[PDB]
Each structure stands twice: as C-alpha cells, then as structure tokens.
Subunit: 274 residues, 4 copies
C-alpha cells in the first residue's frame, strides 16, 4: 500500500511524449532512432524524385539506388557532381531537401546537447534508515554518498514525512512534514553525508513506534538538491522509505577511516552497513 | 473591472519584438518563417549574380531559375560543379554567400534549441476556488494537477491577495498579501496539490465576506514554480481569480481513490468537481 | 565623490578579456569581427597553398585570387570540383582546413546563441528617489517599470544603503544596510512597482537629514532580479542614487489610470513625474 | 591531518569519466583530442573503403592516401567530384559516413559550447585569515577580490567551521557550523569584500584559542556563490584554511584608497597584506 517507491516515483496509477522519450532512451537507441529517420526521410525524398521521373543525371529510370544516394548527396550537401538534378521540379525538391538537411541538423544538435546536459546526480542513498540513540536522544537517520569524482555546492536535503491525517471536517489527506535536521544543508557535499532528525518533544514524529508509523501510513521522503562542480548547474536525486524500511536501534558504520600515514580516506564498501 | 485575467495576464492596456514572436509562434508558423527568409535571401543573392551579368556556368543570361538554384547550391554549400561562378565579383559574392549560409544556420539552430527548451509547465489549475470549513476553521482553497508523466522538485506556490487599499496620505494602491498556506512548498509535486489558506485571526482575509471582498477589489493570484524531472530546469505557471470566482462553503472531490487490489490511483475527471 | 554611478557601476578606478568583448559589442560589430577572421583565416590558408606551389587545379601559379576562392570552397565545404588540390601536402592542408571550417562554425554558433540569451532586463528606474509622508510616516521611495510586453516571476528588489561607518578599532568601511520594504518581492512584476522603505524607529535611516546623509556618504542601491516570461531564465537590473538625488517631501504621479469604459491602463509618460 | 586543502578540495583518498576530462583539459589538449578522433575515424573509414576493394574513382587499389582524402571529402561533405564512390557498398559507406560527419559536428559543438560556459569565478581569496579586535570585540576575518572587469549579483558567502565533535552515543563526526557574518550577502560584489565573524557569547567559536582550535581539528571553509554580469549565470569559488593559517591579532591593509582628484581606487597589490 506504500505511497512512494524507493526511487522516489509513486505507486499512483495513471488514469505521444516524444520529447521525454528522445531524452530518456539509451544512447544506442537514440543513435538508431536518429539513423532511422535519416534513412526514412532520404527514402521519401528518393521516392519524390522518381515520382517526377528520371530527373537525375547518371540515374537509370526506376532505380531507387541512384535516387537514394542522390538524395543523400543532396540532403548531406556533398554535391559530388556525378548525380545532378534535372528540371525546375527536381531543383525545387533539391532546394527543399537542402533546407530540410541543414534544419534537421540543428534539431539533432539541440537533442544531442540536451542529452549531454542530463543532470546525472551521482548520489548513492543508504538501502534503509535507522532510528538510534544519538547524544542519548532517539534520532532518525539515513545517508548519502557522492559517487562522482566531483563535489556539490549548497547541497540542501530534506527529510519529509508524508503521512495520512484526518480533519474535523472529515477530509483524509497526506501532509508533507519537513523534519528538523542536524544538518539541512551541507554547503560542500563531497563525501558521505548522514542526515539526522533528532526526535525531540516538538518533532512531528515524537513518540511514534513501528506499529503507529504503519497505522499513520508514515512514508519518508529524501529530497536531494545541489550545484555540481564540473557541470556548474543543479543535480537532483530522490529516494523514499516506508515504516517497514526503518531499523529501530540501528547504527551505521562510518565510511571514513584513517590510513597508515594518518590521512582520512573513504571506504564505500561500508556504505550499506548497519 | 477585475485586475488580472484567469491566465495570470492582466486587463491593463498598453499605452518590433521579433525575439518574443519567433519563440511564441506555433511550429508550423516558425518553419514557414524560416523557409520564407531562406527563399527570400536566395532570391536576393540570385538577383545579385544576374546584376553582375551572366557570371554563372550552365546559366542562360537573364535566367533567374539558373541563378536561384546556383544561389541555393552556394548558400547550402552543395557545390555540385555544373553551375559554377565566373569572375572575381561572382566569386566574392560566393564567399559572402557561404559565410551567410553557415552563419544563418547557427542563427536558426539557436532559435530551434530555444524553442525546444520552452518551459511547458504542464500544470492544470482548478476552474474556481472555495472557502470551506477545514478542521472546523473556515479555509480558502484551490488545487493544481501535474498533467505531465514527469514530477516537479521544490514546487513553491504562493496564494497572493492583490487588493486595493488607501493610506493616511490618501494614496490608493494595490498590495500583494502573501497568504500563510497549509503547504507552501510540496518538495515533490507529482499528483494534485490542494493549496489552503486557513482564515485565522492573524490572516489578512480574516472576517471578509463575498460583499467585502468585491468592495476591497480582492483578487487572488496563484504563482507556481518548480524544477522539472526530464527537463532539469524550472517551469512556471500562473492563474488568477476574482471574488466572483470564489465558492462559499464549497468542497472539492478528492482526485485520488483506491483500486480493486488496494493501490491508490488518480482520476483527473474529478479535478473540476465541487 | 559618489560611491556607485546611477547605472550601478562604480566610480572605483582599476589599478585581453575577448570573451566579454565578443558578447558586449553591438551586432554590426560582431558580424564585422566574425567576417574579419573569416577573411583573414582564408587568406592564411590561401598563402599556405601557394607556399606549397601551384597545388591547385584551374589556378595560375602565384594567383592569390584562385588560392583564396579555392580556400573558401574548401573551408566552406562547397567543393565545386573546378579548383581541386594536387598532392599529399595540398590534400593534408585541405583535411586541416575542413576541420577548421566546421570546428569554427561550432565556435561561432556558441557565440551567436550566447549573444541571443543576453538577459535584456527591460526595466526602467525612476530618475530620482523621494522621502515623503506615507500613512503619515516618512517613507523612502523610488519605482520600476516593465518596458517589455512580457512579465517577471518572483521579482525580488532590495533597497541597499551603502554608507561609510567607523569602528572602535578605527577601521573605516562601507556597510550594505538592506532596508525593510513595504514589498520586497512582487511575485508578478508586470506593471510599475513603487518600492518603499518606511522610516520607523528601527530603520537604519531613522532620523537622518539631507545634511547627515551627505556626511555619512549615504548611497542607495537598487538591485532588481526576476525570472522572465518569454525567456524563462533570470534577468537583472541595477541603479544607484546619491543623497543629492533624493527629493524631501517628494510625491510620484500614479502611472496607472482609468479609461472611459472603466478599465485600468498604464501611462509611462507619467513615470518620471513628481 | 588537515580536512580540506586550501583550494577547497579535500585530502580524503579515493578507495572512465571522459565527460569531466573533455571539459577540464586545456584548450590546446581539447583541440588535439578533437583532431585525434577526426584523423582516426577518417582512417577507419578509409580502411573500410579499401576492404571493399578499389571502390573509389581517381584511386589506385591499395592506396590509403586516396582513400583517406576521399573519406575526408565525404565526412566533411566537400564532394569535389574527382574521387567518387563506386557500387552499392561504397555508397552505403558514404551514407553512414555523411551521417557520422554531421552528427559528430553536433557532438563537438555541444562540447565547445559547454567549454565556453565554464563558470570562471574570477575571485581571489586572501592567503590567510586573521582574528582581531573589531569594534573592540575579537572577530574572525578573511577577504575576497573580484579580478574580473565584471560584477557579481546576490553574492552569498558563508564562513563554515568544520570541526570534529563527539556525542553521548560515542560517535565522532565533523559538523558544519555556519558562522554569523557582519555581511553574509554583498548584493553587489564588485570590489574586495572582507568577511567577518564577530566572536560573541553565542558564536560557536567563542573563547577558542590557537591551541583549542587545533585540538578540535577546526577547519574554516569559505563558500562563495554569485550571478556573473557579462555571463548572467552563477559562478562558484571555494577556499579552506586550517587553524595553522589563522593570524591572532592580525589586521588587513585596506585595498581601497583615494586618488589625487579625490576618487576612490583599488590597489590589489595590497590584497595579501596584514
Ligand atoms: C555540454 C555538456 C558536456 C560536454 C558535459 O560534460 N555536460 C556537463 O557536465 C554540463 C553541465 C553540460 C551542459 N554538459
Ligand atoms: C533541448 C531540449 C530537448 C530535446 C527537450 O526535450 N527539452 C527539455 O526538456 C529541456 C530541459 C530542454 C532544454 N529541451
Ligand atoms: C535562444 C534565444 C532566443 C531565440 C531568444 O529570444 N532568447 C530568449 O529569450 C532566451 C531565454 C534565450 C536563451 N534566447
Ligand atoms: C557561450 C558563452 C560565451 C561566448 C561566453 O563568453 N560565455 C559566458 O560568459 C557565458 C555565460 C556563456 C554561456 N559563455
Ligand atoms: K558541401
Ligand atoms: K561538389
């Protein structure tokens, strides 16, 4: 019955988005798609030439081979000069094809640039959360790791409790309780950041149990935002956990430890370790 | 007499913006415009060649057909080699035309990319607003829906009352009262967000009536901002309502409901439902 | 002796930035510069060919005309086929020239796009400021006008007093007192926004006079920021005033007024009117 | 044992990122790399043609010279018309090569644009920090200088103490104490900004000494952010200092001074001067 899946995406069911598709497909699929149109549009132009007749020098009438490779030479602006258009109709088709060719190039280039500036937030989230005595006070925790060689500026993470509540009006709704963190922004997120919500008497989760979290349909959202180093621009990552993914009394293993010389170093093997 | 129309744009009358125009026209209009210049500039170059005389091989003197398709072959960098320039003047025109051709390409490409990164904030606003007992306390509400498959990060919406007020100096002005919301930022805007302003004793709208809202020229602005999922960058949407578009005692129908299996799903048919 | 000029730029004297230059020059200058290199690089390549000898078909040995137009045909990828390279040296120069040609295109295109996305904050600031009785309380004011057809989202303006002060340590410095405004953010900046700082007992400028403002070297900075409508991205504008540019008891004329039908309309003639 | 090096990067040891590499290499290296692939891909295509046999007009069978320069003429879309493909296989290779050529162009262009919009935060940080009596109160200071002709909008700097602390649970961790500054945001960063943290009774560093700072492993981070003038977009700079890089009782020399006429001017020689 869980609200938001672990990836942050929700279990809410939806009752031709080409934009989204073109940007999300893997690079091999994209190249295939680009090529697919490229071959198809050249084929449509080849058919347009032969529908005018044998309007191509070096071409045999009815030969798609000659028409297609002439279309390519035209669209691609090669213009070898062996296969050349004949008549006003063919020359008009060439004028339209050349416009298409260099215009499409512009379209492809904007796609490629946009696929290059994909905010690949190389952040790793802990498999589960813990609620343990910190300073002797019970505290809710999970952690993040920067997998990229790079660093993140003004990294602001929020621990958001999304739980179902009822009003005196009778309306049932889910409200987003932003939790008070020990650190809400790590101006430099470069290592592994353990995010903590101390459970004080003001805390929205004060006094809750495994049982009451389930009964309140308690769902914990982790929203991560930050400005990448090599990139410049923002990167965003999300993860969500249910009450079932919380470890009572749980303690994480510090990923940072000291080398023989005395220098501190990070072991990401120890990331999912409690 | 309403201040801001429902789209957010105002009824304030204005007493050659090509930039704006080129970006706002529909894609068919844009393609036509791009083509329009393309044909016109090739025509101007064709005229420039014939003004030099018969400076083109394969061309008849006075033939615009030959000059135009030679211009296209030049601007588009095809260079078949059938129609070729004759003399220093023609060759200088070719050098300028080639610069124009590849330079314009750059201009078109920047237009196309900019038309692709149009923040299409796929947000749907409720037709009207309501003021109903929430928790038994009267509360002002309206709602938003994400029509895009995607999600929105750090979505901050503001309910802004723009009403006319008078000072002891005698100046009449409209001030923007930002209203205290139950949720002012939905870190993840993925479903339908019902925005609420509880009308408490501190609220700027405490104790107002349909009558007094009209007399105070009360106008409600809804400003929506958020960072798109597939996009990365910000999207923005706005809507405005007058006192006449407010429903006293009105109650929205929850768009979220439970499937046979038990999973929650959203019915956007029920969006404009009170 | 004034700190910051009216444009926001300072009177502080500086005791080959091509980037900045290429973006700031007017469009005619930019086109001339682009053309300038284009002609120069083609000339350098033409010289490179003739330094190899008569390595061009249709060319006379020693003819720069033939070499230059062959260079253009190569760099621009025309490849008519009349003037063609001879030998491994010429063909190597062609391979380098073709790389240069299409690579430079990429360079030019990035310049053009960047010159297109110049945040042209079409904001107009009032010539002077005023300090007048508002609600009977003395208040410091100036105003802004959106000259663009478009609107601005989350427009946050700050009235910053930059005045010289001295410490018990003896250090003299200028500090940036951010002033409490009646409206610090106009979520929708579409018309003319009059920015006001009420001079209360907590205000940093409480009780100052024309005389004491001059003696404290009081300088008022206006920083404007907002997210453009047709653009999407941020626009920024700045203006600064000295104590000498402040009008004591001054009152602006409202730019908004009512048409015969009853609709409100804006008269920007009345902008610089006190 | 110092946590973060003076550049902001940390001494934490890491226990094929082409993206990062392509953007970070110097311009000469990038041009060499672009050229490197360009030559290699043309060589692979040349080999592909000769593997089909003597499928090129003007070419000698087995001549890589002819095949390579034909490949260049094809990939670059020159199409002189001297060397032309023979057969369906060669013509198919040409169709793929032309796609590769103009597609790669798009790839290169996105790289070049991205290398152009490198946020070169031309900010200079003071070599060391000082802790001196300001207003008679001990205060922690360092300073920034804008080396670029340009200015920076909404410049927000944070003085972050990263020190090791221990909990009642026994966990040892480093926490990021954001220090209260005299100025935390210089809406216009144009000159030299001296950042100060007054050491009051609430300050996290109140009462610390050179000795106790070392023993608490006190590390001072300086995070700088701002929106560039000619750029538009954000720029970011960072620097970090250890307790060993702090000067007790230290006083900076003002970089701003008055010319003969009376105008204020900045001497950056005096930047690293205490
Ligand atoms: C265009 C581009 C390249 C080459 C790259 O590596 N990435 C980034 O990291 C950003 C910020 C962008 C844009 N892209
Ligand atoms: C360039 C581009 C493409 C291909 C697209 O779908 N959209 C977006 O969603 C963004 C953010 C941009 C830019 N564009
Ligand atoms: C690329 C471009 C165009 C065509 C334009 O009008 N402007 C804008 O308004 C923005 C935001 C950008 C970028 N440019
Ligand atoms: C594209 C570009 C150019 C030409 C330049 O100088 N810089 C900047 O300053 C920005 C903001 C960008 C992008 N680039
Ligand atoms: K060509
Ligand atoms: K040719």
């Amino acid at each position: 019955p869980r609200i938001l899946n672990s990836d942050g995406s929700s279990n809410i069911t939806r009752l031709d988005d080409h934009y989204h598709d073109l940007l999300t497909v893997s690079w091999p699929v994209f190249i295939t798609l680009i090529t697919g149109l490229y071959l198809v549009t050249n084929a449509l132009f080849a058919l347009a030439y032969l529908a005018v007749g044998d309007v191509i020098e070096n071409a045999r009438p009815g030969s798609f081979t000659d028409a297609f490779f002439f279309s390519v030479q035209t669209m691609a602006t090669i213009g070898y000069g062996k296969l050349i258009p004949i008549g006003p109709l063919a020359n008009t088709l060439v004028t339209l094809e050349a416009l298409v060719g260099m215009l499409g190039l512009a379209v492809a280039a904007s796609l490629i640039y946009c696929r290059f500036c994909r905010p690949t937030a190389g952040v790793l989230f802990s498999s589960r959360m813990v609620i343990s005595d910190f300073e002797g006070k019970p505290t809710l925790m999970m952690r993040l790791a920067n997998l990229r060689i790079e660093q993140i500026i003004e990294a602001d993470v929020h621990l958001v409790l999304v739980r179902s509540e009822i009003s005196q009006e009778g309306m049932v709704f889910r409200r987003f309780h932003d939790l008070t963190l020990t650190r809400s922004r790590s101006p430099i997120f470069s290592l592994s950041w353990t995010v903590m919500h101390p459970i004080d008497h003001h805390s929205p989760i004060y006094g809750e149990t495994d049982e009451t979290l389930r009964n309140s349909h308690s769902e914990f959202l982790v929203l991560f935002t930050g400005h990448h180093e090599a990139f410049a621009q923002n990167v965003h990552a999300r993860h969500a956990y249910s009450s079932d993914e919380i470890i009572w009394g749980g303690h994480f293993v510090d990923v940072f430890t000291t080398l023989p010389d005395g220098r501190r170093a990070l072991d990401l093997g120890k990331f999912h370790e409690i």
